[PDB]
Design an enzyme around this catalytic site. Structure first.
Site, PDB file in Angstrom:
ATOM      1  N   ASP A 116      26.922   7.859 -15.076  1.00 35.06           N
ATOM      2  CA  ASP A 116      26.843   8.702 -14.054  1.00 35.06           C
ATOM      3  C   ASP A 116      25.987   7.583 -12.723  1.00 35.06           C
ATOM      4  O   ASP A 116      24.244   8.057 -13.147  1.00 35.06           O
ATOM      5  CB  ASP A 116      26.314   9.321 -14.227  1.00 35.06           C
ATOM      6  CG  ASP A 116      25.915  11.181 -12.853  1.00 35.06           C
ATOM      7  OD1 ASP A 116      26.534  10.686 -11.600  1.00 35.06           O
ATOM      8  OD2 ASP A 116      25.281  11.726 -12.968  1.00 35.06           O
ATOM      9  N   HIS A 142      27.338  11.447  -8.976  1.00 30.40           N
ATOM     10  CA  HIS A 142      28.580  12.554  -9.248  1.00 30.40           C
ATOM     11  C   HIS A 142      27.442  12.585  -7.705  1.00 30.40           C
ATOM     12  O   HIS A 142      27.789  14.052  -6.533  1.00 30.40           O
ATOM     13  CB  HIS A 142      27.402  13.471 -10.136  1.00 30.40           C
ATOM     14  CG  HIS A 142      26.386  14.348 -10.370  1.00 30.40           C
ATOM     15  ND1 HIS A 142      25.187  13.215 -10.632  1.00 30.40           N
ATOM     16  CD2 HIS A 142      25.672  15.167  -9.130  1.00 30.40           C
ATOM     17  CE1 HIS A 142      23.991  13.764 -10.730  1.00 30.40           C
ATOM     18  NE2 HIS A 142      24.306  15.571  -9.811  1.00 30.40           N
ATOM     19  N   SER A 181      19.239  15.712  -8.245  1.00 28.64           N
ATOM     20  CA  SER A 181      20.367  14.681  -9.048  1.00 28.64           C
ATOM     21  C   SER A 181      20.141  13.876  -8.139  1.00 28.64           C
ATOM     22  O   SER A 181      20.062  13.150  -6.521  1.00 28.64           O
ATOM     23  CB  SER A 181      21.688  15.480  -8.392  1.00 28.64           C
ATOM     24  OG  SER A 181      21.841  16.378  -9.622  1.00 28.64           O
ATOM     25  N   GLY A 182      20.186  12.027  -9.071  1.00 26.88           N
ATOM     26  CA  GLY A 182      20.336  10.929  -8.268  1.00 26.88           C
ATOM     27  C   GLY A 182      18.493  10.606  -8.674  1.00 26.88           C
ATOM     28  O   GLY A 182      18.677   9.356  -8.208  1.00 26.88           O
ATOM     29  N   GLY A 189      19.044  20.038  -6.727  1.00 23.95           N
ATOM     30  CA  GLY A 189      18.690  18.921  -5.582  1.00 23.95           C
ATOM     31  C   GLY A 189      18.069  17.833  -5.849  1.00 23.95           C
ATOM     32  O   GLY A 189      17.441  16.982  -5.194  1.00 23.95           O
TER      33      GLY A 189
HETATM   34  N1  LIG Z   1      18.185  18.966 -15.268  1.00 25.68           N
HETATM   35  C1  LIG Z   1      18.857  19.267 -14.732  1.00 25.68           C
HETATM   36  C2  LIG Z   1      19.382  17.960 -14.011  1.00 25.68           C
HETATM   37  C3  LIG Z   1      19.743  19.189 -13.216  1.00 25.68           C
HETATM   38  C4  LIG Z   1      20.684  18.146 -12.492  1.00 25.68           C
HETATM   39  N2  LIG Z   1      21.808  18.460 -11.296  1.00 25.68           N
HETATM   40  C5  LIG Z   1      21.749  19.953 -11.388  1.00 25.68           C
HETATM   41  C6  LIG Z   1      22.837  21.041 -10.847  1.00 25.68           C
HETATM   42  C7  LIG Z   1      22.312  22.244 -11.212  1.00 25.68           C
HETATM   43  C8  LIG Z   1      21.213  22.447 -11.979  1.00 25.68           C
HETATM   44 CL1  LIG Z   1      21.430  24.365 -12.958  1.00 25.68          CL
HETATM   45  C9  LIG Z   1      20.562  21.571 -12.743  1.00 25.68           C
HETATM   46  C10 LIG Z   1      20.918  19.778 -12.695  1.00 25.68           C
END
Ligand SMILES: NCCc1c[nH]c2ccc(Cl)cc12
Ligand SMILES: [Ca+2]
Length: 223
Positions: free
Chosen positions: A84, A40, A177-178, A175
């Site tokens: 993912d 993603h 993410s990844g 943020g």
């Molecule tokens: N543990 C949550 C991890 C997560 C990954 N991308 C996101 C995008 C938005 C929100 Cl609110 C949370 C996340």
């Protein structure tokens, strides 16, 4: 990261920031030329930033290297976030040192109850917004598959695990993410998704990296 701590500069030497003019995702350096992140996080025009602590200040240990190729898992489903995972090849090999280092892939899937380190430059608030400049860390256990499925009925696949705290208050966030989930010195997870951040009975959900080792190794060998 909500409810975490300041890691300390270059204490997480495999952590990378993906930059497209700004930090937008984390990743993990798995050898001198490859980064693993979340599918993603895919976009074109990625610069990989290694050796980062403060992502807004040049502190001296950084390596900035453009991506030559991105490979999204062939079975990535953006609706379910199944599979993912993505690989990024660097245009040139990173210089590996004490502050820029690869993280080992697992030979074994980690059990529930295993303590892991999650890291990132994501939001530090469960409500509202505050983005740290320096890397944040969280120690969190892997949760039982049954507690993970109970939290997210009908959404957990065998390529996902939950980690964190059912009481809430401590979680990966926007943020992050990844980014990496490292357990016993191996990359076990990738920050993938959740229902908000740090909410009660809504732990973070992570890509289960141990299911992808064959794909990672075969992809790297041929690209
Ligand atoms: N543990 C949550 C991890 C997560 C990954 N991308 C996101 C995008 C938005 C929100 Cl609110 C949370 C996340
Ligand atoms: Ca920096």
């Amino acid at each position: 990261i909500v409810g975490g701590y300041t890691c300390g500069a270059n204490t997480v030497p495999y952590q990378v920031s993906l930059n497209s003019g700004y930090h937008f995702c984390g990743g993990s350096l798995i050898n001198s030329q490859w980064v693993v992140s979340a599918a993603h996080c895919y976009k074109s025009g990625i610069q990989v930033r290694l050796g980062e602590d403060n992502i807004n200040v040049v502190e001296g240990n950084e390596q900035f290297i453009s991506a030559s190729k991105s490979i999204v898992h062939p079975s990535y489903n953006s609706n379910t976030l199944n599979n993912d995972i993505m690989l990024i090849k660097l245009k040139s090999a990173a210089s590996l040192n004490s502050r820029v280092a690869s993280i080992s892939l697992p030979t074994s899937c980690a059990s529930a109850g295993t303590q892991c380190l999650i890291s990132g430059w994501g939001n530090t608030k469960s409500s509202g917004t505050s983005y740290p400049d320096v890397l944040k860390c969280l120690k969190a256990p892997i949760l039982s598959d049954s507690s993970c499925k109970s939290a997210y009925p009908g959404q957990i696949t065998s390529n996902m695990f939950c980690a964190g705290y059912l009481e809430g208050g401590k979680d990966s966030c926007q943020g992050d993410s990844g980014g990496p989930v490292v357990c016993s010195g191996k990359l076990q997870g990738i920050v993938s998704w959740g229902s908000g951040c740090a909410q009660k009975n809504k732990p973070g959900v992570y890509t289960k990296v141990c299911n992808y080792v064959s794909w990672i190794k075969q992809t790297i060998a041929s690209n």
